[PDB]
Structures are given as C-alpha cells and as structure tokens.
Subunit: 221 residues, 6 copies
C-alpha cells in the first residue's frame, strides 16, 4: 500500500503475508459477525484497489456472500458511471485519464495507473472509494447472515439482564437502518421486551435513566 | 500512530495487525478483569482517536459493556462541550479550528485533521483526551463486571491466608472509590474479615505492622 | 525479490522464510482449492523466476499436480520459442541478450541476469511471464482437482438455499471456461437446479431479479 | 525505552506488545520462580519508570505479591527521601529539578520529564533505580513463595544424587542471605544431608573435591 | 550472511534464530523427503560457510545421515585439493591467500577471512561451493532414505490413478540418475506398471499424449 | 550485542526477547543433547558477557548443571588470572585498564566498560573468551548427561543397521576425547559391535570402505 515515508514519497509495497493470514483467519473464525467490518477497515488502511481485490479473492468459503459482493460493487460502479460521465475529449497537456467505474476497482486498471492516481496532486481516493463500496456490500452481507429481526428479542424466564442486553445489542448492531430509529428501539424495546418482574422494576425506575442505571437496578431478580 | 522518528517528524502509520490481535485476545481471554485497563493504556501508546475507535469497534462480544462505553464517551464529550464553548468567529490567520466534543473522538474528524492537531505547536492531546474518556468508561465497566462489594470478603474455614489476601486485593482493585478509603479498608478489614484463629494471631501481633509481617505470621494455622 | 526502495534502486533480497512457510501451509491445508491461485499471486509479488521456482519446488506432496505444472510451463516455454525467434546476430553495443523460453524460467538463467533483465530500461517482465505460465498451469490443476462438472449441482430435499448457492458457486469458480457462459449458467441453472418449492417461488418472483432477491425470497421454505 | 540510535540520540518509543505478552506469560506459567528476576532484568533493558510501572500493573494475579511490591517500592522511595533531602531553592539557570522518591517511580513524573532526566548530561538513572527497587522487592517475593528453608533438604531412600542436588540448588537459589554463608552450606550440607551410603562414599572421597567429582562418584548407588 | 545493502556494502550479520528454527522444524517434521533440498537451498541464500556449518550441526537426530554428510564434504574437499594445487609461493603485493579444500568449509577459516574472500573483487563463491557440496551429499542422503527403486511401483487393484501417479513421481523424485533416463521411465513405465483395465485404456489412447490426457482419460475405472 | 551497522559503528542493543525465548525453549525441550552447544554458539553471536550471563541465568531447571557451569567458568577465570598477571602500574595516557578473570565475565564489569573493551582498537574479545569458557563447561555438562560410554553400544537381535549407526553416533558425539581416537572407534567398533550376520557381511566387504558402503551393504538382513 501507499505508506507515508518521512522522506516525502508514497510508493506501494507488497502487502505483508501477515495481513493476508490475519484477514483469512478473521473471515473463517469470526464468520461474518459485525466486527468483520472494522476488521476489514483496519486491515485495509491505505491499500490499493488491487490489494483490496486480492483480499476479497483470498477467502474461499462463503461464495454466496462473495457473489453478493461482486454484485454490489458492480451496482456501485454502474451508479458511479451514471454519476460521472465521460469528458469525451483527448488527453490534456500534463493531464491523466479519468478513472471509470470499472477502473475504480482493480479489474480494468494497472497498479502503476492506480499509484499515479492516488499520488498525483490533487489526489483522488480510488482505493477509498473501492473500500466504501466493499463496506456497503459487507453491510448487506452481515444483514443477511443475521437471521433475526430487531423485534424478536425478548427476555427469557430467568435469563440474566446482562445477557439479555448482550443479545439485544448483538441484534441491534446486526440490524442497521438509521440512527434516530436505533435510539427509538434503544429507549423503549429494551424495557418493552423483558420479563414481568424486570418490566415492573424498570418502570419502577421510570424513564429518563441510563442503561447503566437499568442494569444496576436489574442486577438481581 | 504518531511515532517519534529520529529525523524530527511525527507521521501516522497504520496500526500493526499484531496490536489489534493482541487487544482482541486480551479482551476475550482476560474478559474485563482490572488488568485490561493497563493493557489498553499500553497498547494505545500514541494512538490517534481514529485508532482508538478502531480498537473499540474491533471487539464483537460484550455489547452491553460497549454500549456503556459509547454512552460514557458521549457524556464526556457533552461535558467537554460545556467546559469549552465556541469562539464564534472566523478563522484567524495561520490558525486551525478548535476541536469540539465530537471532534475529539474520531467520528467527526479526519485523520489529517487529527494529525495536524496533535503535531502542530503548541500540541493538543486529542488522542490522550479520548484515551482518558475511554479509561473512565472502562472503570465503570470493570466495576459492573465485579459482582461483589468490598465488605463481603471473609476468610473461610481452612482457606489459606495467601489466597484470602489474593481475593481481598482482587476485590479491592475491582472496587475503586478513592485512596484514603482504600487504605482505610486495607489496614482494618484485612484482619477484620478473617478466621477466628487468624484474628487471634493478627491481634497478637497487633497494629503497626506490614502486610508481609501479617502473612509471614499467618503462614501456618 | 525486486523491492522498490525510496532511494530509487531495485535490488533482490532473499525471500523471507515466513513467505515460504505461508505458501507451504496454504498448499497443504487448503489443498488445491481455487483460492490457492490468488494466494500464489499475492505471495509472489515482484518475485524473481528463481524465487518462483523455489516456491514451486518447496511443496513435497501432489507430485502429479507438480508434473502437470512442469509440463505446462514446458509447453508455455515452447510456445514462447515459436512466438519469439532468435535474432541470430552478435551482441549489439550496450545491449544484453534476449531471454528464451527456457531462460524465462529459472533453469537456464542466473539471478544476476534475471535482475539485469527486470531492472534495465526498458524493463522486461520475465518474472511476470513466469507467473502467468504458472497461473495458467494452476488453472488446469484446480480444474482437475474438482471432480464435478457445472451441470451436476442440484438442490437436495431440505438443503438450505444458502448452502445450495454456496456449493453452486464453489463449482462455478472451479469450472472456468469464459465469462458470458458463466453468466449464462448463473442466470438460469441457479434456479433450474432447485427443489420443487424453490422452483415455484423462484418463478413466482420471475426473471430480472438479483441473487440477493432470490436468497431473501427463498429465506424460508 | 531509550534505544541508542547510531545517529546519536536517545528517544523513547512505545514498548512492543511482544515484550508485554512475554512478561505476562512468564509471570503466569513460571509463577514466581527465581528465574523471573533475570527475566524482568532482561525484558526491562533501558525501560523508563513509566514502562516499568506498566509492566508491573500488567499482571492480574498474585495481588498479595503485588501489594508486597507496592509496599517495598514505597519503603525504598521513603528511604531515598531521607538519603536525598530537598535543596530548598529556586531553579538554577539551565538546571532541571531534582527527582524525589515519588518522582523516581512513574507516579509523580511525566514521560517527558523522565526522558530529559535520563538523557541530559550528566545522566541520572531513574529507570535503573526503579529497577533496583523492583528487584529488591522481587527478592522478598521469591523468598516468600518458597515454603522451605535451606536446612530441610535431605536425600530420600533411593532418590538420585542428580535430583537431590537439583532440589538442593533450587532451594539455595530461593534462599538468599549472603555469599560466604552460601558457600558454607554448599561445602557441608550438600553431603551432610544425604543417604547413608551416599554419606559413606562422600567421606570416602573426603573434602577438597569439586561438585562434579561428587556427582561422578555418586553416579550409581 | 552477506546481504546487499543499497549503500553498496556486503557485511555479514548473525543468522536470525527464525531461520535456524525453520531449518530445524523442517528437518524433524519433513524428515529427509526430497523437498528438504530446496528448503536448504532457500534458507541458505547468501549464507557463509560458517553459517552452513552452524545449520548442519544444529540438527541432533539422523547422525548416520550427518556422518554420510561429514564424509561427503570430506571427499569433495579432497577432490578440490587435487583439482586446485598450492601456488607454492609468498604473498603477492595486495593479494590474499588462496582457500584450500578445508578452508572452503568453515573448519579452517575465520569469518573475517571468508567475508574478505566473498566480498573482494573478483569474488570467489566459497559459500556457494560449500552449498554445492552439501547439496551433493543431501542427494545421496535422500537416495538412501528412499527404500524403493523406480522399477517397483505398480498400480494396485482399485488404487486411483491420481495416487498411483503421486507415488510414482514421489519415487521418481527420490531416485535421481539423469534426465533422458527419467524421461525414459516417464513415458513408458507410467503405463507399463498399471492395472489391467488402466493398461487397456492407456493403449486405447496410445502414445503421443500428455500426462494430463492420461489422467483425464483414466479419471474413472 | 555489538551489531555491525553499515555506517561504521558497533553499539550494543538490548537482546531481543525472541532470542531469550528461543534459548529457553531449546534448553527445556532439547534438554542437554549435544546440539544445545551449537544452539548456544549460534544464539550468542556477538553477544556481550552481560548478555551471556543473562542467557545463563535465564534457565531455571538443571541447577546441578548450572552449578557445574558456575564452577567451570570460575576455574577458567582462575586459570586466566595465573596466565595474565597484573601490570602493577598507573593508567597510561590514552590507555584503558586490562580486564581480569572476573572482569571477563559480567560480574565485575559494567556494560560500558565491556563495550569499550570490545570496540576499541586493537579489539579484545572478552565476550568470545566468556563464550569459550561457557562452551568448555557445556562440554562437561553434556558428557555427564550421557549415561553411556562409547564401548557399550552393540547391535541388537533385529535392530536395523540404520538405527544402530544412529545410536552409535549419538554416543560418539556425546563422548568427546580427541579426533584420532574418534576415528579409531569409527573405523573398528562400528563393525566390532554388530550382530553376527552383520559382522559376517561387514568383513565380507572387508576394510577400506565408506560408511555409505557399509549401510548400503547391510541394507537388508
């Protein structure tokens, strides 16, 4: 990737095999839990689109998820095509060619071209745009891999409030729609979907309290 | 993070995947024992707020604890807003914009802005303030994860004095309120909550002795 | 391999033993699944033909596959011989000798000669051509190791649509012929080779839909 | 820690997570055997007092031992206070403030102050003094963790002389009082605490012999 | 080993313990399969004769094989003595002494002398000659460790053609005599030593076909 | 240790924890087999006497062996004292003090003094002399740990010649007296201590043959 050397140059180097093994092991062990998204966003810091394609083609399993991806980046590139038309002109003096939707990905673009693209001033973040598309696809993937909607989590007979909140926020992280609506579920359905005694003590405390307060109040029975 | 090169420049580099795996394994294996706090404070040496957010979003489990966090940094940012108002003016010549409570975290701030913030002279420790807020939240988290107050530890029938002191200082580390009060429990309840024979020999020694003296006196029965 | 130092020179260094162990472990554990091809293409970034030969001779098992390789690079070199004849002349002033089919591989070529070949301006990618031949052979190897044609995958009695699509795209990745024909299977045989109820609901949705739509429609029975 | 770069500067860098994991694993697996002392002295080469405090707070278990430590460094700092009074004067031109007993540890001292302390000429070894105090405490800790005095080791019925000497020198290393007295036990109690037949052959050899001679003579019965 | 720094100097550094552990683990786990030869040739890139001697003395087991080695390098050095006589003269101005058969190995030669030998212009490859002798000995070792001649491999009753070819090329790699004779076995005994039905279909295809063709024809029964 | 930087300076750096863990694991797993000697000689390349003392004090077990060591370096230092007397004079202009037997080890010598000793021109190899003494002690240690003389190895009833030679050269490596006498055992007792049938075929071949010839002749019964 383009690493910032103190001398003042950004030259790509081959991605360390350590990073590839880390990404692979994360994909297998952690399956497609919501943390794979920050894992990818952290392991792909400054990576080129070719490096991102390498990291995507590295995993062997979950071919349905990878096909959903290969479709999602395809749709994103198609949308970028309609957002960004062709200048329809020759090469201007001292000017490089504008990347297209396919050129944003590593398919129709050489590593030298991508390096010049992301190092020339003003800089264009082709790798960052590819990362954004991949993250958008991973959102749909992690949504599909969660077989439970937000309005199905209810506290069991003697299930601890701690693990109830744990499962509730697992599913909240899995289900992404917005922010205000997430707060909407957070401040009602947390108490709305509890045991009878937990319900009673939660409205004994009433509204206008913090989640820490709810858990320390519902510490026992 | 900002590493001090001998040349005289501080330029961020991508956090090593080794550090991320170390933090993850610590979080899973060591759960949320009090040592996770120095673990975080050591693994986040010089890290940017974006790196801290990456390390926080890395862990998948303990979503209740992570929600307590996301609430605690929210409260800390809100407090910082009321401590630090807006200058309400244009950009001064050769002067950058003052970070806000949200800008302190990596949400509403770019990596370039954070780097300029923590490298311009005079330097402002945005990453250190974010670390302080995260540590303040981890204090509450480790307090909640300990289901035992300080005034519940009592020596068993034939439980060794060594393991009694071990459990006592586990719980003392877990329960944090102050320093003088910690010494207050340390110098009384250590002996106040012992076996009858241990009680007798401890006041046979009397007060004004060291913990080493207590343990070497209570080495046997 | 030839690593681009910021000073402006490309000098070969000994391949790290880490890379060799990574390649070996990939070959053994992952057998010859289609992901070994991007594994090789990533672990051999900038590697010399001698390094590629080292990586090929490293693996001990699958000697039938390695013989298929040693035959495929032989055929590729023979084809390159007939594509590229001999200039049949002495050495021109300030001009090096043109590599042959055997010289492209590391057999009849010294490391110094290869380095001069891939560092002199204009540059010739002898290592890249060797990589291309090895990848062409690995295509045939991965095709042979897959004992199932594309027109044999059919959904079982109560096999989930997710795992059906998984196996279907395993076999699609294994079987490579072209691109338009891959889309041809993708848009028909995916639904053509399903359970009766899945068939009914898939043509209930009809054509002109995405794979994500097919899977979310066939989420249940 | 302060690493000596060839350029001629000593600038602190963040301690590697590898060193922290090594120290932690040593503490857990090797418990508090006498080798943990050279382990600490080797892993803390050039470390700052803040790094030493991080390494001390890293371990979670053995809180009784850590309290003995926190007491021993407290006593050492108090002794250093009475050895080193306050100059009771303003700051001299081009002169820094003298560290105190608490400032020697990382509690009341910033990393910048410690760096200036251990890099200014003439240099003051604040980190080395902290290391010496920690080692003095670890001496008492390893003494307490050994539940056996030197005058209790006696050769069993058919216990080999090799393992007898092994256990004897385990306990000798555990019990530290001086050097001349260690030689005193070494040259008598080694033979004084043996089996009857071993006694007979040892005084058959007589005094004025080496430990190698004793073991090769007592190789058999 | 002599690593080529970009500055323009070749100075030996201590071999990494990682390389030694890699060589050791390869020797133990992989025994003496034919791949240990490319393993050694890759792990000993640029190594000095002293480094090669260290790597040879590192392994503890297979002392019969190591004695065969110590004999083979002895014979190679003796042959080099008779190939290269003594100049029988004093030291010429600005000229170093010519290495002998023993001086080629690290026995009678200091590291400084070897470094000057392999860094002075014109360069002499003492380490490469030692590597060649060690490889020649490893050839005999791997031949001895294979307890099966080439004319003993015959396809079993229902042994797959894949594994038959696997074992055949295992033994072909183990048995090294030449190249033309290897092709001689390759193109006849592959089919000559098969099951009756495999024989029939192989001569149904006839000669003038590739090994890939043989295996895809004999895919089934 | 003193690493040769290309700039032209030799400055000690803290020994990597990797080297310490490697030495420790070698000592525990491989016990004290003869290969621990080249292990130590390879892991202690360029190490200072203080580093050697750290590596020696690192191991916890085998205190009898470590006491034999601490005695052997003591005897070596005492011998060096009688070989090298005191100059009995003041410090000469621009001249450092001559190391003594104790100063050769890291006991009575500071790291700065040792660095100046092994970096000043002309250089004195204090670390190398300490390494030589430690190796001399390890010779005696590995001799003691081998409970079998050279004249006890005899081929069993149906023990393979390969494993017979293996055990024979294990014990030959363990028992070190000289070189000519080692050849003396090598060329007779190898055949002198065999099975009756092996005896018959070995003198069927007769003398004047190589060990490879003996093993290939005695391949079978």
């Amino acid at each position: 990737p383009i690493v910032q050397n103190l001398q003042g140059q950004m030259v790509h180097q081959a991605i360390s095999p350590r990073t590839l093994n880390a990404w692979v092991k994360v994909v297998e062990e952690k399956a497609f839990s919501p943390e794979v998204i920050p894992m990818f966003s952290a392991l792909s810091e400054g990576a080129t689109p070719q490096d991102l394609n390498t990291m995507l083609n590295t995993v062997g399993g979950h071919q349905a998820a990878m096909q959903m991806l290969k479709e999602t980046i395809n749709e994103e590139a198609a949308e970028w095509d309609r957002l960004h038309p062709v200048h329809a002109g020759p090469i201007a003096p001292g000017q490089m060619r504008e990347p297209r939707g396919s050129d944003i990905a590593g398919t129709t673009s050489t590593l030298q071209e991508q390096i010049g693209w992301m190092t020339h001033n003003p800089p264009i973040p082709v790798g960052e745009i590819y990362k954004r598309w991949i993250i958008l696809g991973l959102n749909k993937i992690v949504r599909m891999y969660s077989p439970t909607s937000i309005l199905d989590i209810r506290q069991g007979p003697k299930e601890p409030f701690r693990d109830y909140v744990d499962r509730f926020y697992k599913t909240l992280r899995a289900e992404q729609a917005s922010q205000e609506v997430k707060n909407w579920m957070t401040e009602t359905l947390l108490v709305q979907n509890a045991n009878p005694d937990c319900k009673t003590i939660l409205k004994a405390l009433g509204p206008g309290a913090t989640l820490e307060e709810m858990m320390t109040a519902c510490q026992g029975v």
